[PDB]
Paper text:
We then chose p150△NC (residues 267 to 1101) for structural studies. The elution volume of p150△NC from size exclusion chromatography (SEC) indicates that p150△NC is a monomer in solution. We obtained a crystal of p150△NC that diffracted to a resolution of 2.4 Å. The phase problem was solved by molecular replacement using a model generated by AlphaFold. The final atomic model of p150△NC contains residues 268 to 1074. The two molecules in the asymmetric unit have similar structures, with a root mean square deviation (RMSD) of 0.188 Å. The structure of p150△NC has an open-sheet shape resembling an upside-down triangle, of which the thickness is approximately 38 Å and each edge is approximately 90 Å long. The structure of p150△NC is rich in helices and consists of 5 long helices, 23 short helices, 16 310 helices, and a few short β strands. A DALI search for homologous structures shows that the structure of p150△NC shares no structural similarity to these of other proteins or the known viral capsid proteins, suggesting that the structure of p150△NC is likely a new fold for the assembly of viral capsids. The results showed that the hexamer of ASFV p150△NC could be fitted into quasi-6-fold positions of the map, with a mean CC value of 0.46 and a similar orientation to that of the Fp150△NC capsomere.
From the outside to the inside, the virion of ASFV has an outer membrane, a capsid of viral protein p72, an inner membrane, an inner capsid that is approximately 50 Å thick, and a nucleoid of the dsDNA genome and viral protein complex. Proteolytic cleavage of pp220 produces p5, p34, p14, p37, and p150, while proteolytic cleavage of pp62 produces p15, p35 and p8. Among these, p150, which contains residues 894 to 2476 of pp220, is the most abundant virion protein (in the percentage of the virion protein mass) after the major outer capsid protein p72 (15–17). The inner capsid is likely assembled from the proteolytic products of pp220, with p150 as the major inner capsid protein.
Numbering used by the authors: 2 to 93, 96 to 236, 249 to 808
The structure:
Amino acid sequence: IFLFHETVITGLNLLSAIYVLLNNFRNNIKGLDLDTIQKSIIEWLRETQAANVNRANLIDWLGRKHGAISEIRNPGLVIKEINMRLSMVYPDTEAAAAAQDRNLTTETLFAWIVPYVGIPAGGGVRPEQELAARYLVDNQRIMQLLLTNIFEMTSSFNKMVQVRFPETSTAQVHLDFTGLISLIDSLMADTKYFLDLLRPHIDKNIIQYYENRSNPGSFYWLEEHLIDKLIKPELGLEGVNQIINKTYTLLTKPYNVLQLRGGAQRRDAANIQINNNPQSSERFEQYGRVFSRLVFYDALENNSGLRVEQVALGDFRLSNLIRTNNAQEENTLSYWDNIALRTYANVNDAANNLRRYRLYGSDYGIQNNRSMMMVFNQLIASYITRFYDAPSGKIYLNLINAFANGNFSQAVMEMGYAHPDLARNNNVFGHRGDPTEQSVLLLSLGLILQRLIKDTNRQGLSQHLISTLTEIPIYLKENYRANLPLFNKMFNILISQGELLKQFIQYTNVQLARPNLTALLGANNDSVIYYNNNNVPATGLSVGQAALRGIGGVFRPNVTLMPLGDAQNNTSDVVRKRLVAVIDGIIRGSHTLADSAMEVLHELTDHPIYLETEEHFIQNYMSRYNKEPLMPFSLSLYYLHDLRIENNEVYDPLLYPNLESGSPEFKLLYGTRKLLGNDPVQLSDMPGVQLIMKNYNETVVAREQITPTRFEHFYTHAIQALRFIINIRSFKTVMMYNENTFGGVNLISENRDDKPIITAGIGMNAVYSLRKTLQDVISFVESSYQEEQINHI
C-alpha cells in the first residue's frame, strides 16, 4: 500500500507531469506555426472578395481550418496589430523621419493588398501574396515566443533535450529529445513493473483504478496519450521539431522586399510598391529589438519596456549602503543641479530628491524585469540581502570577495562600469542605449558592495565583513546550506541562457538589426538616455543624472551606456556585437558568483540527507522516539504544485533563495537540496526510501522481492523526471518573460477533464503531497505518530 503509493502512483504522477508539459509545448509550437500561417494567408488572399480585405476578416480566416491548412489557436497574436507603426519593425524600407511614415501602418498594407486578391489563370501564387504573407505576420512576436519556449524546454543536463544547430541549407534548429524519450520509456517500464509485482497484494479495484485507460493519469491512459499520440505516433514530437525548424527557417530566410513609404493623408493610402532593387538587409526580418529585450531591455518602448518606477532608496533593506563612503562621513551621492556651471545638489536636496529605479527588490524574488541583466541584478540583490545579517551587521567575506575584488572589481570599485539606476525625482527611466560588457551591474548594487568591502569603523577595522566561517551564526549557516545551491543553479541558468542565445546568434543566419531609434523617438544622435525632449549625453551631464559631489558624474563614455543612435548605428552586425557583449558580461558575473557560492558551501560541513527539516533532525528524532522518521520520496513532488501568477507571469516563492531558517518552506528546501541539484543521488542519501524497500522485502518472499539495482534504477529515473519538470517550470520559465509560453502551466487540477494528475475529485490519483498543504507534509516528517500518517496514505 505504502510501496504502491511510492512507486506506481509516484511514477504515474511524474509521467503525467511530463505529458502535460510536452502536450502544452506541442500546442504552443502549433500556435506559432509560421508555415501554416503564411500558407493560410495566401489562401485567404486567393479565396477572399476585395470588400472583405481587412484584418478582421483575416483573423476570422486563420481561426478556421481550410483543407490541409490547419487553424491557428490565436490568430491575433501572430498577425500585426492594426496600428503597429511599420517603421517599428523594418529598418530605414522605411523613412521614419517624416510625419507621413506615421500614416504607414499594418492598415496601409491591408489597403495595399486589396488589388491582388484572387488566383491568376496559371494557378500560381502572386508575388504580392508572398509579400503579404511576410509583411502581415508579427514575425518578431513569433520569434520571441519560439525562442522562449525552446529556452524553457532546453535540458542539456542528463542529455534529455539538447538544442543542436546543424547548419545546412535550411536555417536548421533541432530539439534532440532522445534522452527524455528514453527516460519516459524507463519510467513507464518501471511503473508497469511495480504494477505487475504488487497486483497480487492490492485490491483489484485499486489496480484497475490506476491502470484503466479511461481514467486519466493511469498507466494505459498514458500509454495511449503520452506514447501513442505524442512521443511515437496526432502531431508527434518529431512533427513538433519539424514545425520548430520550419518556422525558424521561415523567420530567417530571404524574402522579396517592399518599399514601405506611404501616407497621403490617412492610413489607407499607399505609396507602397514592390522594390525589385533592395538592400540586402531588407530581404531579412530583423529581430534586434526582440533579442535586446531578452538580454537587457528594448529601448524603443516606454521606459525601455521595463517596470521602473522611481522609489525612495530606503525601499531596499540595505539602503543605508546605497552610499559613497562610511556612514559617519558626509555622503557625496548627489545629482547634477546645473550643467553649465557643473554644480551638484547639496546634501539635503540630494538625500530627499534622489530616487532609485525599482529594477530589483529585497522583499520579493524575480517577479518583474525577467531579462538576463535585470534577473542577474535582482539575484545579486537577494544574494546580499539574504546573507547580510542585520543584527550583527556582517556578511561572510568569501561570498562576495571574488565578485567585488576580482572579476567584477571594475563594476564595484570604479565608476562608469555600472548601469545608472539612481537619479533625482521626476526623471523617468526613459529610452536607454546599450550597456557594455562592463556595465551590466546596477550602479546601486555596486555601491552597496563597495560599502561592504571598504567600510571601516573609527579604529580602522572592517565594518561589515566576517573573515572566518567559524564566527558565522548557526542559523546563518543553515541559510547557507539551503539557499546557496539555489543561487548556484540560478546563476548557471543565466549562464546557460546566455550561451544558448550565443549559439543561436552564431550558428544561424538570424539578423538582429534595430529600427531607426533616433528618428522614431526624436532623440539626439549623441543621446545615451532619451525621454520627453531631454537628451542625456554619454558624459551623463544632464540635470538629475546621478553624480558624485566634487568628482564628477557616474557615466563613463563608451562604457556606461552607448548612444541609442540611428539606423546606421543599428545594423545587424553592430547589434550583434552589442548583444554578445552584454551576454558575456552577464556570463562572467554569474560564473564568479556561482563559484563563490559553491566555494562557501564546500567550506561548510554539508551532508544533505533527503528531508532533514534541519541539521541533525534524523539523529535527534531517533534519539527521542527510537525510530527513523518517515521520509518517502513522494513528498518531493510537493514542488509540482501550481505556480503563482502575477501580471500573467509565473513565479515560485518556495524555490527562491530568500527563505528563512525554520520556516516550513525552508524545511522543504533544506530537506530536498541535493534532490534539486545536479549531482547523482545514492539510495543512502534518501534513508526512508531504503527503509520502505527493506520493510516490503521483510513481508514478501524471495520471488516477489526487489533488488537494490531495480530500486536504484527506478529512483534514478524518478530523480531525473522530477528535476526535468522542476527545472522547466520553476527556474528556466520563471527567469524569463514567460507570458504566452508553456513552461508555467499548471500540472494539477481538481477536474479530471483538465489534467491527468487529479487532486480532490472524481478520478483523484495524486500523491499525498499534491493533495495536502505544506504543513501537512512537514508534520508528515516530524510527527512521532507514524502509524496515523501511514494511515493517511
